[PDB]
Amino acid sequence: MKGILGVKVGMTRIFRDDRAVPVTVILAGPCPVVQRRTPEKDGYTAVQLGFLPQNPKRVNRPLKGHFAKAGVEPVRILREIRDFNPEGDTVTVEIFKPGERVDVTGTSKGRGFAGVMKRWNFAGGPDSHGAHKIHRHPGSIGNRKTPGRVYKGKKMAGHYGAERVTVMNLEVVDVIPEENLLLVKGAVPGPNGGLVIVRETKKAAK
Amino acid sequence: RHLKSGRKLNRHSSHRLALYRNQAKSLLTHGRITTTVPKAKELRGFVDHLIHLAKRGDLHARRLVLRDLQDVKLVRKLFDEIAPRYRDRQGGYTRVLKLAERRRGDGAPLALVELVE
Amino acid sequence: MIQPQTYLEVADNTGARKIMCIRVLKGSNAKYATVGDVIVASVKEAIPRGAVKEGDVVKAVVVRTKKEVKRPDGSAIRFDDNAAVIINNQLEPRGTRVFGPVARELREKGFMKIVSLAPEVL
Amino acid sequence: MNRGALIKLVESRYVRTDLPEFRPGDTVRVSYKVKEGNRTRIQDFEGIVIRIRRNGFNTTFTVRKVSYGVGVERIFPLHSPLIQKIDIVQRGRARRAKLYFIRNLSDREIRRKLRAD
Amino acid sequence: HPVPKKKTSKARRDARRSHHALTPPTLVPCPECKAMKPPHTVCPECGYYAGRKVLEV
RNA sequence: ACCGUGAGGGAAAGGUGAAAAGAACCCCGGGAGGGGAGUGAAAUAGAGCCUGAAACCGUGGGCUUACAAGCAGUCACGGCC
RNA sequence: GCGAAUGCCGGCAUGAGUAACGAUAAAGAGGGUGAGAAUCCCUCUCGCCGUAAGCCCAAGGGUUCCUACGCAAUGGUCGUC
RNA sequence: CUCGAUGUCGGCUCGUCGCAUCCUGGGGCUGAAGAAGGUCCCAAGGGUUGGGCUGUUCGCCCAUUAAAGCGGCACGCGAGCUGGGUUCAGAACGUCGUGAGACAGUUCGGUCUCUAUCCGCCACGGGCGCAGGAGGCUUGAGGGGGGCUCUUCCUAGUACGAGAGGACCGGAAGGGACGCACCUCUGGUUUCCCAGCUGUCCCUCCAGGGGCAUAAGCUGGGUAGCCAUGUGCGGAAGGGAUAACCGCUGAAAGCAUCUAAGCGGGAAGCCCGCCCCAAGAUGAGGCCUCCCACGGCGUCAAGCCGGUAAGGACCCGGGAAGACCACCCGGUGGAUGGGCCGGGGGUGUAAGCGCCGCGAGGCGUUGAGCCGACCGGUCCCAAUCGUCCGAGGUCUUGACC
């Protein structure tokens, strides 16, 4: 219940009796680059890859990190726990029976550095009745001899883009077995034309 | 709100434009000029298409790049004097090359960029 | 597309094709009445004679502008905002009524009466 | 490859031609019957007659709010391939300059005035 | 408005200006002359990587 | 000198040497100013140049330091030199 | 014979190489001069004024004005201007 | 403590803990038949709307709600706004005063400053370390985030019942507000992308343009990015121990009791499961691949030097990463930027000539012309040449070959 992905963009698709929209994933398919067996690692499971950048380009140690169960010329590699690898290669070309339910994740489009304004919700102050820190603002940070200070970990200034995350459960809508692609109808949990993965948790009894 | 950006420039837009034009022109004149890093990069993209049209050659082309340069002498001189020598290549009729030094007091890294021969 | 304090257009027995809506009547945290929503409001416009008067009803929103985005991936916006007065239950109050179709309405359904009631060109 | 490539594809399939309808017109008032229905697939060759307002463009595109006066301002926004749609016969004639979002229309129209165009 | 309290001595003073501190300018040699060439650059001679155009009068 | 409209107020700044012998001329610099030669009893007496000490700023050396809570310190002990 | 009198006089550190560089009327290129010129000299692109950033009388100011040389101090760094 | 100063109301923005818990679930009790109520006990989880009149906090009312909680921090918050407020000269009334002036009686006005040093907080890096020196892959103690709730429907209008009403039980659906992402759809922006336009000075008279009418003159539209009013999604299951409350198996109370013996039952709560940080968790690193023991000198020579591109630097070119910076991909053995090019999306039929109209223009050539980011080619141009740094590998023990 795993799949690695170089994702494209999202685009409307029609579903049955109504159109609706999904998003584009592409995965050449990984290949148990490394396994972590339990004697090795008890965080036991799989480390795979799903593509390949110019050949010369491979660091030596890499050349061999491959040597091992040998593979090809990528760089798109990463692992995951309790994830078995009943294969030497896996491409979703079934791996993910469409009209199946998935959970997914990846890089979070590098935002910027936004005042209470953007970062957190409930932005700024007002504007007219008293505008020198105008419309937008930064609330109050605590107080005198109550905690004799400014608090410790409540929302705050700048940097909130160069970050990542995952979107819970959504649609595996359809699987295009050739051009290893999946249309899902999700938030593209981060840019498009870039990276994410798919995994499917849910002892989920509605 | 912002991060992705296409093309990108300083001063102000009417200003910039003013620049692009003036420079584009002066350079046309000497085939090579010196300014600061950026100035170069850009005047490059710019004079790049202008001149592509320069070759394009004829009624319309003249009409446009002229729309910018405003002037027979230069205008035409390009159009017929150099455009030719350029008619064959696939663009990038410009070459941006970073110089030795920097302007005084400011310490600005300059370049020389010319029409490529 | 919606509204809180609103100049809601009407039609039918309303002694005023407009009322001012207080609050979207839905879940205790209203914030927007749209096509199909029922709302809480009173009369803003004057009732020639009429039966309506100058008090207040609860009723149902029809039309609205700013995106009639429907399930079928089809849509429409009416350069107009209205509702039909709703006698408790819902059951609209007047005979005729000046307006037309757009499933949305129908889909809320409860008012199928309204449904059949104002089919044609206006 | 990328984007262009593959998506180009996905849609390629689901939409094929948005339904070889091809005759678009911009002003044309025209009428269609979409499977628009519900209540025991009372999918009725439903037809609306409207003055063509606009159009979104790529796989998914939109036969825009062709605006029609029932006895009210009813403007209808439909997605192009939308299987929803069946009939798209045209009536008026795709005219007038300053194109799309030709709202002048419902803007401050006046049947005559539209008719002045 | 809000002004310090002393200056945690030279001690701090430097601490800060400290981690600040200077650095050097990067150089290699003229693929033509000899001297210090910083990546893409010419200089009062070799003025090139093929076709000077620069240095003289 | 300088503040003030004026009445009016009202600073700072002293010393090279025994005497000019106070800097030819050679050297880097656009210059200063820096290194030489001569001064000489001295020039860390060199031109605001006697004595020129405190604050403060610098170059070098010994010891010391990245799990550390202490204005201070200072009692013990140990490693260093 | 004085830490210590928001003390006096003088130096001298301190945020601190941060704040700003005095009006959003814009610059950019090309030769010239120099020891060095974003920052001086000509030339060519562009903008801002003009009913003022006009030209003139007077007031007050009084050196400067020109001409040659010249910058180390002075122009809020620049500078050979 | 405070008068060489601790800016006193209300509001705003931001809150953070308490339960005496409004709403929530868990409960025994009933003067409980159902439904619904009233009454204590258990427990903070989240939740705890909009208006009106008032400078009011409070309050009364309009409409809601599941709920529309009370209260702590100087009645939290002016080095974070507001300044209506009370608490500066005016002036005003009415009220006192023989008047001067006054009134915790009212009324109209009335100069709230702000480059953060520190500790604190939010983020971004430079260190130096977790004794070979190397590029990537992970496990997480522990820390953070999320934990809400209403309406419908079957179960059944069956259990209750006279009747009107209407269940536990358990199973669907659909909203509200909220939280995390994200453009396709919808919709806003789009400072030069296109288009119509007026006054004027200039190009060369015409037309065809040009700047200036903001730092876009004006208007009508408008990719990409970013962005909601738009799109997906979640707040779960489920497991372990508990809360009041309920028992069982049982003596001391040779009859009785859940209660020292021992076993179980039980809340949105606690612990885990969900997601996101994370060994600078001086207690890691854990696995993966990989480079091998250079040289001259006072020695536990853990010091000075070439070392391996082992690798990585620096510099160049770039990047939805981004203040710098680190992040990251390329560096011509290229596609990395720009150019061109093709193509999507735009504006909306071009400039010229042609035809009908005295003229204004129309129609044609013309869905024409000009085009920024958007999908993808192609060494046209610029990613040249180089520089530097970077292991030899402590001692003790034990275990093996």
CB B51 within 8 A of CB B69: no
């800060």: which residue's tokens? E16
Instruction: Report how far residue D81's alpha carbon sits from residue D62's, in angstroms, rounded to the nearest whole number.
Output: 8
* Alpha-carbon distances of C61 from A17, C37, C89, rounded to whole Å: 27, 6, 15
Instruction: Report how far residue D15's alpha carbon sits from residue D13's, in angstroms, rounded to the nearest whole number.
Output: 5
Helix (H, G, I), strand (E, B) or coil at D105: helix
Question: Are E and C touching by the rule of 3+ CB pairs within 8 Å?
Answer: no
Chain E residues with beta carbon closer than 8 angstroms to that of B97:
40, 42
Q: Determination method here?
A: X-ray
Instruction: Report how far residue A27's alpha carbon sits from residue A172's, in angstroms, rounded to the nearest whole number.
Output: 14
CB C1 within 8 A of CB C66: yes
Question: What DSSP designation does A64 have?
Answer: H
Instruction: Report how far residue A62's alpha carbon sits from residue B62's, in angstroms, rounded to the nearest whole number.
Output: 57
Domain boundaries, chain B: 13-117
Q: List all residues 6 or more positions away from D45 whose beta carbon is below 8 Å from its beta carbon.
A: D33, D34, D35, D86, D87
Length of chain B: 117
Torsion B22-B25-B30-B35 (CA) sign: positive
CB C16 within 8 A of CB C47: yes
Instruction: Report how far residue A25's alpha carbon sits from residue A197's, in angstroms, rounded to the nearest whole number.
Output: 9
CB D95 within 8 A of CB D116: no
* Alpha-carbon distances of A30 from A34, A86, A89, B98, rounded to whole Å: 11, 12, 6, 45
Instruction: Report how far residue A16's alpha carbon sits from residue B117's, in angstroms, rounded to the nearest whole number.
Output: 61
Q: Do D73 and C72 touch (CB under 8 A)?
A: no
Instruction: Report how far residue C38's alpha carbon sits from residue C54's, in angstroms, rounded to the nearest whole number.
Output: 19
- Best CA proximity match to E43, nearest among B98, B99, B36: B99
Protein chain E, residues 15-34, with a C-beta closer than 7 Å to any atom of nucleic acid strand F? none
Question: Which residues partner with B50 through β-bridges?
Answer: none
Structure tokens of B100? 């030795």
Q: List all residues 6 or more positions away from D76 whose beta carbon is below 8 Å from its beta carbon.
A: C74, C75, C76, D48, D50, D65, D66, D67, D68
Instruction: Report how far residue E27's alpha carbon sits from residue E25's, in angstroms, rounded to the nearest whole number.
Output: 7
Helix (H, G, I), strand (E, B) or coil at B35: strand
Angle between helix B72-81 and B13-30 (nearest 10): 60
Produce one character per residue of D83-114: b if its CB has 16 or more CB atoms within 10 Å, e if not: bbbbebebeeeeeeeeeeebeebbeebeeeeb
Q: Can you say whether residue B10 is alpha, beta or left, with left for phi > 0 and alpha for psi between -120 and 50 degrees?
A: beta
Which element (helix H / strand E) includes C61?
strand C56-63
* Alpha-carbon distances of B112 from A120, B64, B96, rounded to whole Å: 48, 27, 6
For the beta carbon of residue D29, count every other beta carbon within 10 angstroms: 18
CB B77 within 8 A of CB B92: no
CB A71 within 8 A of CB A31: yes
Which element (helix H / strand E) includes A99?
none
Q: Which CATH superfamily is domain B13-117 in?
A: Ribosomal protein L17 (3.90.1030.10)
CB C107 within 8 A of CB C73: no
Q: Which of residues 24-43 of D touch C (CB under 8 A)?
A: 34, 36, 38-39
Instruction: Report how far residue B36's alpha carbon sits from residue B24's, in angstroms, rounded to the nearest whole number.
Output: 14
* Alpha-carbon distances of C119 from C87, C110, C116, D41, D66, rounded to whole Å: 21, 16, 6, 19, 20
Q: What distance lies between CA B107 and its chain's CA centroid?
A: 24
Protein chain A, residues 148-187, with a C-beta closer than 7 Å to any atom of nucleic acid strand H? 149-159, 161-171, 185-187
* Among chain C residues, CA nearest to D105: C79
For the beta carbon of residue C122, count every other beta carbon within 10 angstroms: 12
Instruction: Report how far residue C107's alpha carbon sits from residue C37's, in angstroms, rounded to the nearest whole number.
Output: 12
CA distance A183 to chain C (A): 18
- Find the radius of gyration of the CA atoms of chain A: 23
């105008």: which residue's tokens? A134
Question: Which residues partner with B36 through β-bridges?
Answer: B110
Q: Can you say whether residue E10 is alpha, beta or left, with left for phi > 0 and alpha for psi between -120 and 50 degrees?
A: alpha
CB A51 within 8 A of CB A76: yes
Structure tokens of E11? 């001690």
* The CA-based dihedral angle spanning residues D49, D26, C102, C54, taken in that order and rounded to the nearest 10 degrees: -100
Structure tokens of C97? 């009524």
* Among chain E residues, CA nearest to B98: E41
Phi, psi of D6 (to 5 degrees): -50, -45
Helix (H, G, I), strand (E, B) or coil at E18: helix
* Alpha-carbon distances of E26 from A183, A196, D65, rounded to whole Å: 50, 39, 63
């290699």: which residue's tokens? E28
Instruction: Report how far residue E19's alpha carbon sits from residue E30's, in angstroms, rounded to the nearest whole number.
Output: 34
Phi, psi of C83 (to 5 degrees): -160, 180
Question: What DSSP designation does D90 have?
Answer: E
* The CA-based dihedral angle spanning residues A173, A178, A180, A181, taken in that order and rounded to the nearest 10 degrees: -30
Which element (helix H / strand E) includes A135?
none
CB E48 within 8 A of CB B98: no
Instruction: Report how far residue D26's alpha carbon sits from residue D100's, in angstroms, rounded to the nearest whole number.
Output: 7
* Alpha-carbon distances of C54 from C4, C57, C83, C97, rounded to whole Å: 19, 10, 16, 19
Instruction: Report how far residue A80's alpha carbon sits from residue A90's, in angstroms, rounded to the nearest whole number.
Output: 15
Structure tokens of E16? 């800060």
- Best CA proximity match to B1, nearest among A115, A192, A21: A115
Structure tokens of C52? 């309506």
CB D78 within 8 A of CB D91: no
Chain C residues with beta carbon closer than 8 angstroms to that of A14:
73
CB D3 within 8 A of CB A193: yes
Phi, psi of A47 (to 5 degrees): -125, 115
* DSSP secondary structure string for all residues of C63-75: E-SS-EE-TTSBE
β strands within chain E, DSSP E? 28-29, 36-37
Identity of the residue numbered B24 = A
Instruction: Report how far residue C70's alpha carbon sits from residue C67's, in angstroms, rounded to the nearest whole number.
Output: 9
* Alpha-carbon distances of C2 from C75, C81, C105, D70, D71, rounded to whole Å: 16, 9, 15, 22, 22
Instruction: Report how far residue B24's alpha carbon sits from residue B65's, in angstroms, rounded to the nearest whole number.
Output: 10
Which residue ranges have CB below 7 A from strand G?
Answer: B 11-12, 14-15, 18-19, 21-23, 25-27, 29-30, 33-36, 39, 70, 103-106, 108; E 3-4, 7, 10, 13, 16-17, 20
* DSSP secondary structure string for all residues of C76-106: EEES-EEEEEEBTTB---SS--S----THHH
* Alpha-carbon distances of C4 from C38, C59, D45, D70, rounded to whole Å: 12, 14, 37, 28
Instruction: Report how far residue B32's alpha carbon sits from residue B39's, in angstroms, rounded to the nearest whole number.
Output: 13
CB B19 within 8 A of CB B46: no
β strands within chain A, DSSP E? 2-10, 13-14, 19-20, 23-26, 34-36, 45-49, 77-81, 101-108, 142-143, 149-150, 163-171, 174-176, 181-183, 194-199
Q: Do C77 and D39 touch (CB under 8 A)?
A: no
What resolution, expressed in A, was reported for this entry? Answer: 4.5
Q: Does B32 touch chain E (CB under 8 A)?
A: yes
Question: What DSSP designation does B86 have?
Answer: H
CB A201 within 8 A of CB A103: yes
